[PDB]
């Protein structure tokens, strides 16, 4: 019931919106998981691991370079936009909106959202393997050796880039190998981010779960905490307290206007 949801929306002073893979899938963002979602001969399970990076950093960087570069042609969708406009509009009224996203593509930021927690990191951040520095990086290509590399076609040869020519840390003294600042399979979420998320979720008086569900990770980490405060939760997804079935780019903008 959209009207009942909107009655809560009109009164809520602090909205937390959790976004999952569904909202990035509607922008056409490949993630390489499952049904013939291949990059050359591999899937994300093979590459998005510290062991793959340790064994073949050039191959893993080709894969991340490809992913960075495809984002030039993948755009924010109406769900991203509605969420950013809603944040701006409510902020002007002294009402707060925060986004907790599992997505690493920065589409929320390209849509105009400010208060965003990236629990899995970003394709457009690097972390230095040596000094640990995390930095924004949108450079195309990230390093000259990767220029024109990363093609997904199974026939493509490996670039076999020497490790010293992959992205390096720019502090002259350091020059460590950079890795994508993304949470890989088998790795832990950042505790500081989770603390901040918990504070937002404790404060919130309405919670939306978009392009994933309350019962799965990562929403399942916190959604019980919010439900037990008596706080309404509204789901927007394509799956079987409120639930709006369909593509988020159709359902969300009318709910948030």
């Amino acid at each position: 019931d959209l009207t009942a949801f909107r009655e809560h929306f009109a009164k809520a002073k602090h909205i937390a919106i959790i976004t999952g893979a569904g909202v990035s899938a509607e922008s056409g963002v490949p993630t390489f998981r499952g049904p013939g979602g291949f990059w050359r001969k591999w899937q994300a399970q093979d590459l998005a691991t510290p062991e793959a990076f340790s064994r073949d950093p050039s191959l893993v960087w080709e894969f991340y370079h490809y992913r960075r570069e495809v984002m030039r042609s993948k755009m924010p969708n109406p769900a991203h936009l509605a969420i950013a406009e809603c944040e701006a509009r409510l902020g002007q009224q002294g009402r707060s909106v925060v986004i907790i996203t599992q997505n690493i593509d920065e589409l929320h930021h390209r849509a105009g959202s400010k208060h965003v927690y990236e629990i899995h990191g970003s394709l457009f951040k690097t972390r230095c393997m040596s000094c640990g520095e995390v930095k924004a990086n949108h450079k195309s290509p990230i390093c000259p050796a990767l220029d024109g590399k990363g093609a997904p076609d199974p026939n493509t040869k490996e670039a076999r880039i020497p490790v010293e020519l992959l992205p390096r840390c720019e502090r002259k003294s350091c020059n460590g190998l950079l890795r994508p600042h993304v949470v890989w399979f088998g790795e832990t979420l950042d505790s500081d981010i989770l603390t901040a998320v918990e504070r937002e979720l404790e404060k919130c008086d309405l919670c939306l779960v978009v392009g994933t569900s309350s019962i799965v990770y990562p929403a399942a980490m916190f959604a019980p905490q919010v439900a037990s405060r008596g706080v309404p939760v509204a789901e927007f997804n394509m799956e079987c307290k409120y639930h709006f079935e369909g593509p988020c780019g159709s359902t969300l903008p009318p709910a948030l206007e």
Binding site: G186, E187, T188, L189, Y217, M221
Partner: peptide, 8 residues
């Protein structure tokens, strides 16, 4: 620390 996907 929390493993992504709970390690699953």
């Amino acid at each position: 620390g929390v493993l992504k996907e709970y390690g699953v």
